[model samples]
Target: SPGIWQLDCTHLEGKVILVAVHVASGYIEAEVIPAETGQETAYFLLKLAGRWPVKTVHTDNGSNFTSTTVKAACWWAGIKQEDGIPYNPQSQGVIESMNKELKKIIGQVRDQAEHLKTAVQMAVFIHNHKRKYSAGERIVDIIATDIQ
Candidate 1:
């Protein structure tokens, strides 16, 4: 689950950040920085690859991914970076679905306030382990098989 997070200007001092969430495991990585430049994106991507052996990464043709720094990083890590076609929403189905689920969980947790962390943890945990979709199996089970 490869996804990018744009900086939210209204939040604070206009800090830029990038986030990548693993679709299968619901594992998330977030980096806060000054800008979404290629160097920063590449550095964060390197860290992510070190944590997980990613086979493929899909993203739009954002400047970060297209820049030489990102290309070099991907080459060094032996991970394929796939650029989706312009205006094609279907290309990013995994992250899109993850985002929808995240929103639902967040909305529910917003009411409790103090339970937000617990809600997020439960949501991610269930998404990766207990939850089953059409295949009648947990996502972690599938990911473990793929890793082997």
Candidate 2:
């Protein structure tokens, strides 16, 4: 059940959104973290460990992602960390696109005067529902039908 996960952070309306995108199915999990810090990222990873069988985490060389705190959490959870070259879009193309999409959706939600948490949840739900794999199935549907 091991899977490749692309992790990244995006900021919106004075909050940080920690994003995790499954590389295979394109399923997304977005969290509105209070701030961007190593401790917050570690806590988020710990929570994700219970929800997803994360094998490898691919991310840019952001300080928070590369911090000792996050590295220790990954070690404790048996998850390998793969850092991409700084200033390289090709390395994190998937997560970059995901961040753009989430920002657009969440921005619209914010314009509607919705709660920030609700905006992030809506963005995740909408993204996973709309994302299609090569097999022409929605990410959520694929997750539902996966035997594992």
Candidate 3:
């Protein structure tokens, strides 16, 4: 499962954005005002691959996924891109969980604006480091094996 992030500019003054999660490890990555082209996605992919050796990326049939820029990026990275079924949300369950988690964190930050940055950081840290029943262990522990 890939982390799912929604792109929005409502609070970003018309800038591009993305929210992503690492499904197996529950690591969250967020970017505000990302590049509109696939460059940003490629950048993210580079980081993710360096950190996790990702082999496949699943996304919707949006223009970003179909864009030549994105295709070229994936090819350059040696990663396969998988598109979800049309109108089928279930196909993206892992990313959906990330969306819910991000929403909950955002809701908390909305009320405590002063600590928004810290709160977001802490939430992501915990999600990435904390042990989960689903994984039956901590993400850091799992990542250690793959990363090393």
How are the candidates ranked when ordered by lDDT, highest leading?
A: 2, 1, 3
lDDT for residue 81 in candidate 3, whole number 0-100: 74
Model 2, poorest ten-residue lDDT window? 131-140
CA shift at 1, candidate 2, in angstroms? 9.7
| Clash statistics: count for each candidate | 0, 0, 1
Candidate 2 lDDT, tens digit per residue, 1-148? Answer: 2357777788887888888767667777778888878888888888887787788887644785569999999999988887755356664675677688888988767655558988788877777666345322544455566645
Tell me how far the alpha carbon of residue 13 in candidate 1 is from the true structure, in angstroms, after superposition. 5.1
TM-score of model 3 (CA atoms): 0.62
Model 1 TM-score, all chains together: 0.57
Q: lDDT by residue for model 1 over 3-118, one digit each (tens)?
A: 32221111112554355655444455454567677787778778878876666665435675578998898899877886644355653665566556655754666566554445
With candidate 1 superimposed using the best TM-score fit, by how many Å does residue 72's alpha carbon deviate from the native?
0.5
C-alpha local distance difference test of each model: 0.55, 0.74, 0.54
lDDT of 2 at 138: 46
**What C-alpha lDDT does candidate 2 achieve relative to the native structure?**
0.74
Off by over 4 Å in 3: 1-17, 34-37, 86-94, 109-120, 133-148
Of the two candidates 1 and 3, the one with more favorable lDDT, higher being better, is: 1
